[PDB]
Amino acid sequence: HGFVQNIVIDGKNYGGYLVNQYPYMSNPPEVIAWSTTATDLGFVDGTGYQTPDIICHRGAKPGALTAPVSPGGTVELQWTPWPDSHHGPVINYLAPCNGDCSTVDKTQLEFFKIAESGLINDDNPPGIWASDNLIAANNSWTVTIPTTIAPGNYVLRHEIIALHSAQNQDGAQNYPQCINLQVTGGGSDNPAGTLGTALYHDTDPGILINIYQKLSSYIIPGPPLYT
Numbered sequence: 001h002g003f004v005q006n007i008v009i010d011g012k013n014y015g016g017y018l019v020n021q022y023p024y025m026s027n028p029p030e031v032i033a034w035s036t037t038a039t040d041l042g043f044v045d046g047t048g049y050q051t052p053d054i055i056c057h058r059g060a061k062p063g064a065l066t067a068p069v070s071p072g073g074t075v076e077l078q079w080t081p082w083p084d085s086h087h088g089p090v091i092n093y094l095a096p097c098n099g100d101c102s103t104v105d106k107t108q109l110e111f112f113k114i115a116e117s118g119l120i121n122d123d124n125p126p127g128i129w130a131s132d133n134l135i136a137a138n139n140s141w142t143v144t145i146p147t148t149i150a151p152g153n154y155v156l157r158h159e160i161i162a163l164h165s166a167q168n169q170d171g172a173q174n175y176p177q178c179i180n181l182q183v184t185g186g187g188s189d190n191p192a193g194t195l196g197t198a199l200y201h202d203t204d205p206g207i208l209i210n211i212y213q214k215l216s217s218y219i220i221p222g223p224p225l226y227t
């Protein structure tokens, strides 16, 4: 259980959507982060993969603000302290807003994968995952925005999937966090985009999986990485 508390871009903090404060507030602040109803700090499991909840988490609505990112610049997302138990991949997708991200229909966003990290080492099952990398980096993930994509406004959909219960149907725990970015530079790729509700299915080999046994490979779920 956890959520993105803060985002660092070009030497300043953009406060995140504090899901344990703002939902109780009724005049909460404008942020670059999407609002959610996930006040349990919980997940979207396999029962929700073909519901709108999977896109930017349960009941999610666009953030009011959009953060400019320098060309090929870094977006550092800072989580609440991530449990060692919650082993699994950290995956990053962009969808174009074709306009102000604050007014987009989330149901029509088309995501391309810009980064994935999965099973790093399996010497000691369940092993060392991207989630363990995120913990070792004091609960922060660094995303580099490609230079080869068309500039414009994009939703960054940032996700940990926890696999600690994933040996059972609908056991995998998706933690998607969305923020609004204004990508800059000279690129011109418009990568083939996957609907939120076509990202994952509940029987994918990276999703329905027993992590506690020796694993020879791990197929990171979601569409193919763009390069």
Ligand SMILES: *[C@@H]1O[C@H](CO)[C@@H](O)[C@H](O)[C@H]1NC(C)=O
Pocket (backbone or CB within 6 Å): 135, 136, 137, 138
């Ligand atoms: C995280 O930072 C704290 C100090 O702020 C430190 O005590 C902790 O051990 C750090 N890093 C890692 C890899 O644990």
Ligand SMILES: [Cu+2]
Pocket (backbone or CB within 6 Å): 001, 002, 086
């Ligand atoms: Cu949890």
